[PDB]
Amino acid sequence: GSLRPGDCEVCISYLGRFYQDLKDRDVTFSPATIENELIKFCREARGKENRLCYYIGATDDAATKIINEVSKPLAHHIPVEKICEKLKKKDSQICELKYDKQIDLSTVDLKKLRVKELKKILDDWGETCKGCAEKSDYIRKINELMPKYAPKAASARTDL
């Protein structure tokens, strides 16, 4: 990879091939046709190419009309790479698809916490102590049941 943490890679993986399939078939697109093509694209595109398009306006779920900023230039193929750098400024959530997504541990990660907090986790499931000398000994035996029991509660099940 590179020194960057992340980028709008899903959008440049998509806009720059979407408009290309238009002129590749010689669709002769020019009027309000172009804005329509984005929809029939976004609805079958790919699992992440179905999420970036909700923010532009090509889904039945959208709250936006910025799709017109794609219909003007597409006939000419000019901004199709840099479009994603302007969508990044509409919101980061269009780029956060990232082929990497996001998690909630960024404020509750066992490494940020204390032994006093971790001593409850194994006790809520019934694991109890297996060494209990430092935080690391808790993190590692918690991590074995942490994902499966992330949705866990007293009043719900996975096999009812």
Q: Is residue 112 within 8 Å of 139, Cβ to Cβ? A: no
Experimental method: NMR
Q: Is residue 127 within 8 Å of 159, Cβ to Cβ? A: no
**Residue 122 to residues 100, 127, 150, Cα–Cα distance (Å):** 29, 5, 13
Instruction: Name the CATH superfamily, with its identifier, for domain 103-160.
Output: SAP domain (1.10.720.30)
Q: Is residue 29 within 8 Å of 37, Cβ to Cβ? A: yes
Q: What share of the chain is helix, strand, coil (3-state, %, to 5)?
A: 40, 0, 60
Q: Which of 89, 75, 91 is nearest to 22 (CA)?
A: 75
Go through the chain and tell me how many residues it has: 160
Q: Is residue 108 within 8 Å of 72, Cβ to Cβ? A: no
Q: Which of 13, 153, 154 is nearest to 94 (CA)?
A: 13
* Burial zone of 139 (CB within 10 Å; 0-12 exposed, 13-18 middle, 19+ buried): middle
- Tell me how far apart the alpha carbons of residues 122 and 138 are, in angstroms, rounded to a whole number: 8
- Tell me how far apart the alpha carbons of residues 73 and 79 are, in angstroms, rounded to a whole number: 7
- Helix, strand or coil, per DSSP, at residue 145: coil
Q: Is residue 56 within 8 Å of 38, Cβ to Cβ? A: yes
Q: Which CATH architecture has domain 1-102?
A: Orthogonal Bundle (1.10)
Intra-chain end-to-end CA distance of the chain, in Å: 44
- Tell me how far apart the alpha carbons of residues 117 and 140 are, in angstroms, rounded to a whole number: 14
Could you state, in order of their start, the residue ranges of all structural domains in the chain? Answer: 1-102, 103-160
Q: Is residue 34 within 8 Å of 44, Cβ to Cβ? A: no
- Tell me how far apart the alpha carbons of residues 137 and 144 are, in angstroms, rounded to a whole number: 12
